Amino acid sequence: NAQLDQIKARGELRVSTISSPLIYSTEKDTPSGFDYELAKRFADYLGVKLVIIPHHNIDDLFDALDNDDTDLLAAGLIYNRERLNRARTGPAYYSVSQQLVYRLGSPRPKSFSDLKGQVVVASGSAHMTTLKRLKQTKYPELNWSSSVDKSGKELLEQVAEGKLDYTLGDSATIALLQRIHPQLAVAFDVTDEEPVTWYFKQSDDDSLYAAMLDFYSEMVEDGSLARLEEKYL
Numbered sequence: 654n655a656q657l658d659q660i661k662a663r664g665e666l667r668v669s670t671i672s673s674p675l676i677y678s679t680e681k682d683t684p685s686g687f688d689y690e691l692a693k694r695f696a697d698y699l700g701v702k703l704v705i706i707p708h709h710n711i712d713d714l715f716d717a718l719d720n721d722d723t724d725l726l727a728a729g730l731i732y733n734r735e736r737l738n739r740a741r742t743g744p745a746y747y748s749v750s751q752q753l754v755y756r757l758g759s760p761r762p763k764s765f766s767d768l769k770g771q772v773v774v775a776s777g778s779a780h781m782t783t784l785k786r787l788k789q790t791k792y793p794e795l796n797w798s799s800s801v802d803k804s805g806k807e808l809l810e811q812v813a814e815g816k817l818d819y820t821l822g823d824s825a826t827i828a829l830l831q832r833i834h835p836q837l838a839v840a841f842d843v844t845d846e847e848p849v850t851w852y853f854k855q856s857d858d859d860s861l862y863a864a865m866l867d868f869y870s871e872m873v874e875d876g877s878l879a880r881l882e883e884k885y886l
């Protein structure tokens with residue numbers, strides 16, 4: 654049978670995520686996050702239980718999606734053309750800018766020419782693509798690396814604790830973490846707004862994908878998706 658039939662027979666919609674106040678947070682009894690809330694409503698729409706699996710590594714998320722270990726990715730993921738070989742994006746929900754973060758009390762960098770330490774980002778993130786682009790063009794001196802086991806949220810926490818000098822994160826996540834870690838500061842903006850979307854496996858089977866688009870249509874219809882977006886942004 655088709656993808657949706659299998660989901661219905663499992664009685665569960667398997668969604669892979671990353672822990673963050675914007676995506677999926679369990680810092681108290683009731684979980685929260687935009688991706689979590691939208692995924693719950695989607696599971697309800699399909700008539701199945703939601704099964705969330707938070708990961709740390711984006712490359713792993715895409716491998717799971719390709720291996721049918723999960724049904725969709727809902728993890729604050731920025732559009733990345735390299736992911737289209739095996740995956741397809743759902744509709745765009747909101748946009749975020751990429752910002753370079755440093756810790757208050759330490760020197761404020763003025764540009765990528767002025768960094769003292771390394772900038773570390775999450776492996777497979779769109780943040781990584783941006784750094785590669787800049788190093789091959791305007792900043793040959795740029796010292797950067799990728800973290801295989803830390804998320805953008807965990808990387809921001811490291812900057813806050815003084816264990817990492819800088820990270821390149823998204824504007825929405827930075828804003829939320831700042832209310833818990835006021836020592837996090839923006840040195841400068843790096844990119845203009847980029848859209849966030851869910852990802853699904855590319856297949857000739859649209860039993861799930863078409864349902865996702867039907868669900869999205871219903872959500873937009875009375876301005877309900879806008880309200881939800883604005884609540885977390």
Ligand SMILES: [Cl-]
Pocket residue numbers: 729730731777778779780
């Ligand atoms: Cl990303």
